[PDB]
Amino acid sequence: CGELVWVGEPLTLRTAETITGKYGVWMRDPKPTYPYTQETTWRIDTVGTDVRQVFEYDLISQFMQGYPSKVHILPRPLESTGAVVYSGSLYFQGAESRTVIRYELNTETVKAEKEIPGAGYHGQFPYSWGGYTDIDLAVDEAGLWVIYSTDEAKGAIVLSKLNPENLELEQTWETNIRKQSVAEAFIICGTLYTVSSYTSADATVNFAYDTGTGISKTLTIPFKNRYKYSSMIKYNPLEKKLFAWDNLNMVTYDIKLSK
Numbered sequence: 001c002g003e004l005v006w007v008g009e010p011l012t013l014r015t016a017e018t019i020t021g022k023y024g025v026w027m028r029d030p031k032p033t034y035p036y037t038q039e040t041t042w043r044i045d046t047v048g049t050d051v052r053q054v055f056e057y058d059l060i061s062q063f064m065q066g067y068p069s070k071v072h073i074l075p076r077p078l079e080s081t082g083a084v085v086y087s088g089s090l091y092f093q094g095a096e097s098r099t100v101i102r103y104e105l106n107t108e109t110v111k112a113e114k115e116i117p118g119a120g121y122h123g124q125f126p127y128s129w130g131g132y133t134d135i136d137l138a139v140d141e142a143g144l145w146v147i148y149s150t151d152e153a154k155g156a157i158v159l160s161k162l163n164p165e166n167l168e169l170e171q172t173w174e175t176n177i178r179k180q181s182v183a184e185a186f187i188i189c190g191t192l193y194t195v196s197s198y199t200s201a202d203a204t205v206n207f208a209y210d211t212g213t214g215i216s217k218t219l220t221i222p223f224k225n226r227y228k229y230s231s232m233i234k235y236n237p238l239e240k241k242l243f244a245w246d247n248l249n250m251v252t253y254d255i256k257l258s259k
Contacts (some may be wrong), residue, residue: 001189001257007205008254009224010244013229016041017207017249018058019066025081025245026083030139030238033088035106038238042085043068046247050077050095056105074103075110079121079246082232084137086144087164093135096122100137100146101165114167116160118150128183129198131230133234140187141237147192149179157185159192159211175209176216182206183228186242189257195223195233226251 016026023041032038041121043055055068063069076094083092089111090103098119102112119125119135125148126133136147144162149155157179160169175192179185182194183203196206226246233244242253 003191003208003258004193004205004219004221005258007221007223007242010226010251010253012250013243013252014249016043016059020057021066022055023249024055026245026250027083027085027090027234028236028239028241029085029088030236031087032238036088044078044081044083046081046245052077054090054105069138071257072103072105073202074101074107076101077124079135080232081131082133082234083137084139084144084234086139089164091137091144091164093121093137098135100135100162102164102167107245112165112167114169116146116148117169118152119148119158120150125179127185127230127232128180128197129228129230132186133232135232136150136185136232138185138187138228138235139237140235141189145187147185147187149180155179157192157194157209159184159187159209159212167181167250171210171211173214175206177209184231184233186233188235188237188255193219195225197228223253 027042039060041057052214053075054072056070079093079095096200098116100114104111138145144164146160157175160172182196185194190211192209194207197203203223209216229246231245
């Protein structure tokens with residue numbers, strides 16, 4: 001679980017789109033929990049205002065291969081498609097709010113709701129590609145996180161580790177990078193990494209903040225994005241890959257860590 005040293009070229013995901021026909025924003029659980037398995041996937045369709053539908057699929061279904069097994073109707077709409085599934089629950093930001101909601105998928109139950117203290121929302125502290133990217137939920141090898149900013153932090157990235165059961169903020173770190181200066185961010189092995197553009201063609205993983213030590217540094221790892229679409233990239237620690245949505249396709253990026 002060392003420092004990132006390389007990011008691969010983006011590879012189009014064809015699996016879920018092939019079996020289902022939907023390009024959709026796809027999510028997988030890095031801690032699959034019975035009765036779900038590694039073949040289970042969830043899609044948020046990105047069409048419409050105040051989206052509440054999450055579609056659940058078994059891609060090796062013995063009953064209805066190709067069609068959703070279940071459609072969940074969330075009790076609050078999504079602020080953005082940047083939700084995560086972790087340990088059997090969907091964690092999402094409620095529209096027009098700084099609230100994170102834990103929705104248990106197999107029981108359709110809200111198990112926790114938490115206001116992220118002081119967090120900006122709805123266009124106050126977006127990433128550099130704009131949109132409602134103020135609050136970014138992330139999963140890594142140690143569980144669930146949230147990436148945000150606050151007025152007191154003057155727009156610098158704040159990072160909190162979340163208790164997945166009750167959404168308490170178990171530890172917080174105020175980092176030394178402005179959120180609006182980077183295009184997206186993700187956590188790998190307890191290090192926050194950010195992506196920046198530095199010309200019209202060229203982007204890099206440009207910064208690292210290690211939550212274990214507090215130490216940060218500039219990086220220059222090439223990051224080959226196809227587009228500049230306001231979204232959140234999500235690390236999947238089970239697959240050890242980054243998953244991104246660009247409005248056309250889901251793509252994965254392979255990673256290498258120093259050994």
